[PDB]
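Notes to self, Fatty acid synthase:
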Amino acid sequence: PILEKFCFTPHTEEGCLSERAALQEELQLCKGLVQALPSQQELPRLLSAACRLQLNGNLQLELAQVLAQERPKLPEDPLLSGLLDSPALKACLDTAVENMPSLKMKVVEVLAGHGHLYSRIPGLLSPHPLLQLSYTATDRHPQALEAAQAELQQHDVAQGQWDPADPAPSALGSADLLVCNCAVAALGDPASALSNMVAALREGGFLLLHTLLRGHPLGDIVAFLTSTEPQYGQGILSQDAWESLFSRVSLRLVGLKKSFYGSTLFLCRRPTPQDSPIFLPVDDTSFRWVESLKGILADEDSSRPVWLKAINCATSGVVGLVNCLRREPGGNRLRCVLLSNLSSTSHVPEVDPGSAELQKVLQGDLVMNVYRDGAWGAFRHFLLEEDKPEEPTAHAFVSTLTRGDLSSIRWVCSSLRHAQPTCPGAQLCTVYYASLNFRDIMLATG
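result:
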């Protein structure tokens, strides 16, 4: 079985990966080498080699090229690929998937040679039971990405030749989602690349971009390095600079995930032709609104979006209702807004049409919009850890979890946590030494 959890994910998370200790240690090591101009990780090795040849006046060429760094192992560096090892990417992909008119998704990756997202996106979408995916990889040059062709073959991916600098070939054409991985792959120019990409992106589609923000410690540290390649320095920009650049191409930002060390994951959506939006309160306990909604949905000719909003109660089930309706004919127009606050102290915002919050969510134009304790996000699914939980106990017993395999023997909690000492027939006794008989070996062996 596919075991998951169903929690509430804000569309904007900052300081995402603070919990991890290894990332902080890597950051401390990296700045330490930077200070005054040591680990198996590739990026610290590169920094150490750069500082090794000269303490002052380091040559750009010597640090640019060195043994053990020519390989595209920079993405493998935990600091650089931190966000793609966390559930932020899963949340972004799920948000992209949900706001799709149909059940099929068209995802095209730019600079697939270095981005390496081709080996992580396809697996993350396996849990969805009905979704059908069309992943296509692309690179500036053919020979690039020629390696790992078996990896591309084991999944279903399509080769390409597009260089984001030039207009996208019509073969890719309009696409549901675009992924770049600007952290490692080199972008020729921000404005030109984004213009070509937004041109490629279909209407209402999404663009997911991973980049290392400038102005943050790791951003500056990488900026000093790679100085030989001006392109790689073009991808590194400022958060406000990125936001401004987005406004130029009339591409709107729906979500953003910011690592504690600077990395960020921009999710953007292509605006759609404006239409007058319908509204229908769904908090009436008499379910009289069902007739109202049934009346609206009947006129399939109309293309006016429907915005089912409930603000009176925090236990409304608008989420399931919109999830199920969207499959039904005419469901593409349905959209939701729920105010589900769990803390009584939290103030309830105003959802009146004049208010700003409704305007911002409408500009976002997402199917799900759930407000809980000062955040706007949607409930999302994640895989849960594989370990069997363990708790400190005074009563436990040994058991072969998988019959026949002695390797599966482990301690488990025992019913004896609940017992009565008064009864003489109980005589619950502690155990200091337990013997093993032939019968026990026969049982464990199966």
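- Residues 169 and 186 are 19 Å apart (CA to CA).
- The two ends are 25 Å apart (CA to CA).
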